Amino acid sequence: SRLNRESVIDAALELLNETGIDGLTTRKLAQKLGIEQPTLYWHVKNKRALLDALAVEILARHHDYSLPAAGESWQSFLRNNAMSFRRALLRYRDGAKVHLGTRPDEKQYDTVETQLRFMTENGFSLRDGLYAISAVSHFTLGAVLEQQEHTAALTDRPAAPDENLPPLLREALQIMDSDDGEQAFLHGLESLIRGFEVQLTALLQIV
């Protein structure tokens, strides 16, 4: 089939969503694309180049709150941005894994620059605005990775018996699987945002 960048990425995303990050092999991508391996290598050099492109395209497709609205508070922007990032990551199996360790792509420069500027315009030093943005990113990636991997593990083997659990852990387990992770994520997200606020408003006051 077509091997423009768009369609290679399309197929890799499909493959990703079907078989997870382990399924993204040269061989399996070539088979999905209906091609021989040397054909694929002309287009895609290695798994890393593919993973980097997927990380970019997952956000291009499904990360729909990447810039602050007019007059938006930094708090509200981090909240909306985090929700959007999470949704984009959850779209595809192992999409959080695919993002890990990437650095913004040239295609994302204007966006991330605007994010960083926006933070600074709201009183954060570049460093502290970056640490806030990093923390939101890290938290969200962790939350998503734990949710997606847990679902994958369920499919492999069952949890161990309930009746040997201590009681708080037993409740906690009910709670965690009472949903897909959203409630815990949103609660943690508010904690994070408020802690950034405490740090910021403190200025040079001990806090």
Added chain:
Amino acid sequence: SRLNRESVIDAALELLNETGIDGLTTRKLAQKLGIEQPTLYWHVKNKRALLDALAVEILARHHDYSLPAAGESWQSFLRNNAMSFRRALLRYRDGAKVHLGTRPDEKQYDTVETQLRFMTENGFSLRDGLYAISAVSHFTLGAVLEQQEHTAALTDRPAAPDENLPPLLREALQIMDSDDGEQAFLHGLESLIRGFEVQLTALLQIV
């Protein structure tokens, strides 16, 4: 070589640290252990069972602040615990990946129960104490995964040219690679802990 559980895990950890989570294959573990594959399968059924055991043992070896000190504040306990968790995860290549989606093991029940109880004794509802503990865990796992994957990506291919970067992003990149991620992690960690505190102390007050 020896194929008690301890030594299987030892070898898998070595292999993990040498070749990362992709290197943990039946075949490569059997080769490290000096055995044929059917010998290994007697001991280790599948990659998941192995990954689960590694997640447990990485914390048994190197997670040395799992319980609160006498009279310790919940804040200080989450801080020390998070630092320790991070250190344990960073010990082995892809050790954060190995943890993802796991649930506490029977061997960890008394510890995690104590953690949950401790939170509740400090005024958190079980749910809110769990959300705090989850958030700390998620943040730490994200931070560690991004640090370790970034190091792995460096080895594969170089970052793109500096001179097309916008300036805040260029600075931010200097900052992020000014260290291994510790400074950003510690800063984010304080934000998280303080946000939990704001949430807790608020009681039924709008906050």
